[PDB]
Write a protein that binds this ligand. Structure first.
Ligand SMILES: [K+]
Ligand SMILES: [K+]
Ligand SMILES: [K+]
Ligand SMILES: [K+]
Ligand SMILES: [Mg+2]
Ligand SMILES: [Mg+2]
Ligand SMILES: [Mg+2]
Ligand SMILES: [Mg+2]
Ligand SMILES: [Mg+2]
Ligand SMILES: [Mg+2]
Ligand SMILES: [Mg+2]
Length: 148
RNA sequence: UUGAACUCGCUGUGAAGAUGCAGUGUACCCGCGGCAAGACGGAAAGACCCCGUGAACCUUUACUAUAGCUUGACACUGAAC
């Protein structure tokens, strides 16, 4: 299937590229996510005539993501409280939803889909390092302090 | 049940076990109560047996198929290393 990329897609190409991808790749991911469109004559001519504003919007999105990442980094450390045993091990667990809620209460709005926990979901009291992905290329870090 | 009967015995003859043929013996016409030796008695187009290039249902390492079960290829089906 021939498609026109509407953004930067890793291992595929840059915006405006015309690429041949597997039909399922286009059908179930790229088009529904908005990262590409079918390479019909209408689409090709329309995009080529109306192209540059899209890079302007992509730059605006990247700048907004950078600003949000800077705010997240400036937030530094966020503290979450739960219940645990005397050994410091939590009976329950601390996940993306409540981490994002704590960050939002701290001031920066982050969705649960932007939380990236490398070593699974937190289960012990102490300090952990969590990552945030607000853009496909930028990354932020937050210290999480779990207390009883 | 019943082709029609003026519907005896014997010995023979004879699709080869005769009331009905031949020879011969016996016998006046007709009921009623009884008995079942014969009318190859009545009943059911022999069930045994064979035959038909008949039937059915059953069996199986008979033949040919086939549901099911199982194998792989392609499709729905994508990304990275
Ligand atoms: K005579
Ligand atoms: K009799
Ligand atoms: K035969
Ligand atoms: K039968
Ligand atoms: Mg004789
Ligand atoms: Mg005689
Ligand atoms: Mg009498
Ligand atoms: Mg009697
Ligand atoms: Mg008889
Ligand atoms: Mg017969
Ligand atoms: Mg047969």
């Amino acid at each position: 299937m021939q498609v026109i990329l509407l953004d930067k897609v890793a291992n595929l190409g840059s915006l405006g590229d015309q690429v041949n991808v597997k039909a399922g790749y286009a059908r179930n991911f790229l088009v529904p996510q908005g990262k590409a469109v079918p390479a019909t004559k209408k689409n090709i001519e329309f995009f080529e005539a109306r192209r540059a504003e899209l890079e302007a919007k992509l730059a605006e999105v990247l700048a907004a993501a950078n600003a949000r990442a800077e705010k997240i980094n400036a937030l530094e450390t966020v503290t979450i409280a739960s219940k645990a045993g005397d050994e410091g091990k939590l009976f329950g667990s601390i996940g993306t939803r409540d981490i994002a809620d704590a960050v939002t209460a701290a001031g920066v709005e982050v969705a649960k889909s932007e939380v990236r926990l490398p070593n699974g979901v937190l289960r012990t009291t102490g300090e952990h390092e969590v990552s945030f992905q607000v853009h496909s290329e930028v990354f932020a870090k937050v210290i999480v302090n779990v207390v009883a």
